[PDB]
Design a protein around this ligand. Structure first.
Ligand SMILES: NC(=O)c1ccc[n+]([C@@H]2O[C@H](COP(=O)([O-])OP(=O)([O-])OC[C@H]3O[C@@H](n4cnc5c(N)[nH+]cnc54)[C@H](O)[C@@H]3O)[C@@H](O)[C@H]2O)c1
Ligand SMILES: NC(=O)c1ccc[n+]([C@@H]2O[C@H](COP(=O)([O-])OP(=O)([O-])OC[C@H]3O[C@@H](n4cnc5c(N)[nH+]cnc54)[C@H](O)[C@@H]3O)[C@@H](O)[C@H]2O)c1
Ligand SMILES: CCCCCCCCCC(=O)O
Ligand SMILES: CCCCCCCCCC(=O)O
Ligand SMILES: [Zn+2]
Ligand SMILES: [Zn+2]
Ligand SMILES: [Zn+2]
Ligand SMILES: [Zn+2]
Lengths: 374, 374
């Protein structure tokens, strides 16, 4: 009987850029019409949550960040039909309203109700469900998973299998689905192709998993941190290259290695220069390059459009191109059926209260995904 | 007989940038092994030829330019198997060797034997068949059609229907096939879609023809020259807009007109600014933008990669993505079977001796295609 009552609980509040999270008591309002309040069970530390701290991914502060998570419904607002109290759920940082021109399109997933293109840090109704020290606190991407309890819009949550291990399937809420979908859905990697993956973190390892699932013959991992190469090979890389080892730019190295350019390249870092390098290294007539990394706010890249004129395709995607609410329950079902592995992504486990230690592990280069448990 | 002998004939020589063509006698050597000497019958004036004069498309000078043409085989070198003397032919500025990794790929057409990516201005053997006033003269894109006679490599020529009208089907050598293919093969325009076409010259009108053939519901022509709008509507534009008429940038105008962005946009001008505008005006989640225009030499554009991260596809192509030697005869057969029209592209038909007057018509905005007749 917390239904319809304010809940006091602990959250990780970010008051200022480039500062530690503050673990402290917040007030979580009850859900309004078509809103869902979730008791969080596990949440991943994604580089995009660090980009909020760095100020390179801009969203209003102060904020409760976190977007890669799983929990159990505590209560539903009036009119909710797609979840019930006690259901296991994954918050959807890319919503699926099911009504807009994008949700109706066979290949769109970037639903027009998203809080990604022009972040306001609110619920759909333009208000916050979070108070801290008597001050309103922003939401993040309509999810805000660094909290014992959050409130999300119904279009931002999916019901998943009741037997789901939530400390694993939280990765379906971001890094696994993003990287796997970038390969199998956005690029549509083909059997016997040569792929180059720039960045061997949680999301780039998931791209490798998707390239290997699609039957690529060669998967070249690219990272400046050679410590990332062993796990990249475990999940399917056939060879790994560190740009720092070479006198020549890595686009020239990769073009040589692939006897004239790769079939598919993926930027999975978030840098302007590696976005251009990744486009250049794909074959000039028929190559495809996919941007997955989140570039720094309000910065333009410079490129030569002759790279496109010869025949290259350049595209990007959020969340692996998956329509979120249709896709997340299916991805969980496929995980339960052993169609892909999540354990290779999980290098560390900590209690939520050690969230700062989890960010330090990511920043040091030591972790892939740290999973925090509430 | 001319076979096996040097031919002295008339050609339009470009001795240096930003000067008129010089119409004078050149010597055309006989074809070597796997080469074809063609008597030219008609050639079109394409903006790319003007870009060589402007210096914004770089190729070695002095040069015989011209790449959009048709003629009749005068003689064949040893080892030629695909054409014979007397055949009607179209030179292929994009070759099709049939042997390279691109020619073997189902979606590639930018054959590695091309003289487009690093223009040398020669035959495949690295020599020139042209002299003028005792100086060697460069080839252009392996074609050089501003000459009563040219010599091309076999991989740079297609045999066409003996009954085809060369004064019309010369456009299948560049402008028609480029525009049409950019719509139907590269973009793969869908039935009921909304398309935006930037530039309503010969290639942009051919893009409109392809979008209409593909069943687009709306085709928005964009040009700063409103005199181009009447013919754009004749061949299928549903509306035309002049950016100079608006206070707001045209990407904003086209996003509003299309209720959130177009399905397909095409840059058919060759400006960096319009390439970015065209990408921006396509819907952010599922839009596709195709670069057809040839951008100015050695100049980079600046763009915000978030345009791609939301889901846009950005791609370019040469010659409408068509594998040139397979496609050109089929396009001529389809023209003979009334599957498309070429007359709407032809505004002027001049003798070859009036080449300079033909270029002045293009530069002044008066013409679409001028066809020069030998
Ligand atoms: N498109 C989406 O929906 C989506 C989802 C999830 C993450 N992201 C972004 O994807 C990117 C990767 O996220 P992640 O895997 O969690 O991050 P991560 O774990 O930091 O991995 C990035 C990897 O890139 C490596 N790296 C850094 N700089 C360079 C360089 N200059 N050259 C070659 N390698 C380099 C780095 O060593 C690290 O292993 C970040 O930009 C995220 O913000 C996008
Ligand atoms: N990709 C290929 O294989 C290929 C083949 C043929 C042509 N080209 C290029 O395609 C482009 C078009 O060729 P074309 O149709 O012969 O040329 P064109 O006949 O000069 O047509 C270009 C049109 O662009 C219009 N225009 C110029 N500036 C602007 C502007 N700022 N805003 C809006 N409209 C503008 C201009 O008024 C004209 O009607 C040129 O860049 C060619 O070099 C590429
Ligand atoms: C990517 C290299 C492109 C070179 C294009 C040379 C001109 C092709 C013919 C044309 O555009 O009319
Ligand atoms: C198209 C603008 C999107 C920028 C923000 C993307 C953040 C989503 C979460 C993630 O990347 O891990
Ligand atoms: Zn929607
Ligand atoms: Zn993420
Ligand atoms: Zn070839
Ligand atoms: Zn041309």
């Amino acid at each position: 009987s917390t239904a319809g009552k304010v809940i006091k609980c602990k959250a990780a509040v970010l008051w200022e850029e480039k500062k530690p999270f503050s673990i402290e008591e917040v007030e979580v309002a009850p859900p309004k019409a078509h809103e869902v309040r979730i008791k969080m069970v596990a949440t991943g530390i994604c580089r995009s949550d660090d980009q909020v701290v760095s100020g390179t991914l801009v969203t209003p502060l102060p904020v409760i960040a976190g977007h890669e998570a799983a929990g159990i419904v505590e209560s539903i607002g009036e009119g909710v039909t797609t979840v019930r109290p006690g259901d296991k759920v994954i918050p959807l940082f890319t919503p699926q309203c099911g009504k807009c021109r994008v949700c109706k399109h066979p290949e769109g997933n970037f639903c027009l109700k998203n809080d990604l293109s022009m972040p306001r840090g609110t619920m759909q109704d333009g208000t916050s469900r979070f108070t801290c020290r008597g001050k309103p606190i922003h939401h993040f991407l309509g999810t805000s998973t660094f909290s014992q309890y959050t409130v999300v819009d119904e279009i931002s949550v999916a019901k998943i299998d009741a037997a789901s291990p939530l400390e694993k399937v939280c990765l379906i809420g971001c890094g696994f689905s993003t990287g796997y979908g970038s390969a199998v859905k956005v690029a549509k990697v083909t059997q016997g192709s040569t792929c180059a993956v720039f960045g061997l973190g949680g999301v780039g390892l998931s791209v490798i998993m998707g390239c290997k699932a699609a039957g690529a013959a060669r998967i070249i991992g690219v990272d400046i941190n050679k410590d990332k190469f062993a796990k990249a090979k475990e999940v399917g890389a056939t060879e790994c290259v560190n740009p720092q080892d070479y006198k020549k730019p890595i686009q020239e190295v990769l073009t040589e290695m692939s006897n004239g350019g790769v079939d598919f390249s993926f930027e999975v870092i978030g840098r302007l220069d590696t976005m251009v390098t990744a486009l250049s290294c794909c074959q000039e007539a028929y190559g495809v390059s996919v941007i997955v990394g989140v570039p720094p706010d309000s910065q333009n890249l410079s490129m030569n459009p002759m790279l496109l004129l010869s025949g290259r395709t350049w595209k990007g995607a959020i969340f692996g191109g998956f329509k979120s609410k249709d896709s997340v329950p299916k991805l969980v079902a496929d995980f339960m059926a052993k169609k892909f592995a999540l354990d290779p992504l999980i290098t560390h486990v900590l209690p939520f209260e050690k969230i700062n230690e989890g960010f330090d592990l990511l920043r040091s280069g030591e972790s892939i995904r740290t999973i925090l448990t509430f």
